[PDB]
Every structure is written in structure tokens, then in C-alpha cells.
Amino acid sequence: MRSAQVYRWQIPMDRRLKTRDGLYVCLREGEREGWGEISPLPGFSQETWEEAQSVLLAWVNNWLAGDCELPQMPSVAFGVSCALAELTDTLPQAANYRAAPLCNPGEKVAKVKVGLYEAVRDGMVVNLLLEAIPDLHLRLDANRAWTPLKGQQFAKYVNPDYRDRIAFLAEPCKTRDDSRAFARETGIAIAWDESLREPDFAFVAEEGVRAVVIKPTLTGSLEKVREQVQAAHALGLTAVISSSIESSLGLTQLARIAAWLTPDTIPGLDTLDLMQAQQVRRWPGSTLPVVEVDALERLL
């Protein structure tokens, strides 16, 4: 016997993004229970919050009637599939809560957002960090920020002898041909990110490419995310499971999907401190308050 609940919320963030708005699905079959988060990201997700809601509510009504197509809309396919996996006890409880800290115990790994302004500033900060911590490895996020020139102007400031400790620079340039060229000229390893979510992306052996970054809320189902992880691992690449700024609930399932699918790869989930509260599920060690389901706006 099936039942379902949908919640709508907005969490305050630490004039771009002052709230994060989203949704939870709770599927219930017999005594079992599954949750999932549907939170499309403004500027990044194609579909909107309110479109997400419509499709989520409609899909749920289908689910109650026993039919089992999932929507191909990324945010909804994702959350709906997390709920479905929790129903069947398949998503293990084990999770990777180890952080590659942003900003700007084991393998030391950090994350730097680059390409925001001057290429110079980024390479300088990058060099500084790698110089100070001899065993630090860095993950860099460009989001296609650079012309070939700026791709060169950034690397200008990074000691070639530390460059092997940049695990990846994601999407340095505006075209993939230029990012590949930057990899070759600079000997700096690259990752694809936004390329993966554009139509007709192929997993292909490319010299210089060592990682892919997989954002599940912008990709779709957990089944599709898995697929992309397996494709990468066949090519020898690192699959990083990453945050699309999900609430604590989605972040903990991303943590769980990481341990399950990319067990030795720290996920890119250090986005909780951007927000002012957790909801439903705790992230271990966060002292941010926790909103109970009790207090969530219920649409279904």
C-alpha cells in the first residue's frame, strides 16, 4: 500500500542567492520509507523550482498508480530515484563525510574556485597553497572561465614542479578543444563538468583529462549517475560526486552515493556552511540548527 508526501521549503543562505528553495519527496510503501530532494539550481538547472514541483507532484500520482517511468527532468529524476533506492534499502547508510575544503588526516585535498576574476589572482593563490603544504593536492573549478590567453596567464603563476599536485582543473576554457590544448601546454590535468550535461557528451580517452565531475541534481537519476561513474572508471578517470547546493538531506545522500559509487574519492560536498540551517537529516559535525519535518510546508 503506497502513500507519499511532498514538502516545499526555503532555507536562508549565509545580491545573488539569499535563499535556497526546494522540495522533498517521501515515498512510503508498506512499512518502508524513502526520501529524496528535488532542488534545481538557479543559473544551472534548465527547469525551475515551480516546474520541478509540478512534475514531481504529477510523477508521484503516477507512482501511486504503479507505473514506473521516471521523469527525465534532472532534479526530479534525481530525488525521486533516491527515495526509490531508500525504499528498497539499496543505498547503503555508509557515507563519505571527508572534506576537500573550499575557500580562498589522510591525503590532504582542498578545493579552489578559479576563473571568477583575474586569472593572475587564481594562479597566485594556487601556487601559494601548494608551496605552503608540500603534500596538498588541489581541485580547481573554472566553470569555463577562460580564453586561451587567460588560461596561460593563470598557469604563469604556478610552479611547474607543483603542477602534478593539481588533481584536476575543471573546465578551464570556453571550448573543449581549448581546454585540451591548455592541458597539453601546461601539463595540468583537467576535468569535465558542464560538458557532461550538454547533449551528446562521450566518455573518451583524452590526453590531459583525468577526472569528471558529476552533479546529480543537474544530471538526473542515481541510475544515470552510476552509469557515468562506470564510464569514467573504465577510462581510468576520477569520478567526483558533487553538490548542486542541496540541503543537508541531499548532501548526506550525495555523501552516501559517493561511498557507494566512488568509494576512494572524496565527494565535493562542502557547501552546507553556505546555508543557515539543516533539515530532516544531520550532517555529522555541523552545529547548524536542524529543521524538523514537523515544521516543513506540506504540499501532499
UniProtKB/Swiss-Prot annotation:
The keyword Magnesium applies. It comes from the Bacteria. One of its GO terms (biological process) is menaquinone biosynthetic process. It catalyses: (1R,6R)-6-hydroxy-2-succinyl-cyclohexa-2,4-diene-1-carboxylate = 2-succinylbenzoate + H2O. It is an enzyme of class 4 (lyase). Its cofactor is Mg(2+). InterPro entries: Enolase-like_C_sf, Enolase-like_N, Enolase_C-like, Mandelate_racemase_C, OSB_synthase_MenC1, OSBS_N. Its EC number is 4.2.1.113. Mg(2+) binds at residues 141, 170, 193. Keywords: Lyase, Magnesium, Menaquinone biosynthesis, Metal-binding. Pathway: Quinol/quinone metabolism; 1,4-dihydroxy-2-naphthoate biosynthesis; 1,4-dihydroxy-2-naphthoate from chorismate: step 4/7; Quinol/quinone metabolism; menaquinone biosynthesis. The keyword Protein biosynthesis does not apply. One of its GO terms (molecular function) is hydro-lyase activity. CDD domains: OSBS. The active site is at residues 113, 215. Converts 2-succinyl-6-hydroxy-2,4-cyclohexadiene-1-carboxylate (SHCHC) to 2-succinylbenzoate (OSB). Does not show detectable N-acylamino acid racemase (NAAAR) activity with N-acetyl-S-methionine as substrate. Belongs to the mandelate racemase/muconate lactonizing enzyme family. MenC type 1 subfamily. NCBIfam families: menC_gam_Gplu (TIGR01927), PRK05105.1 (NF003473). This is o-succinylbenzoate synthase.
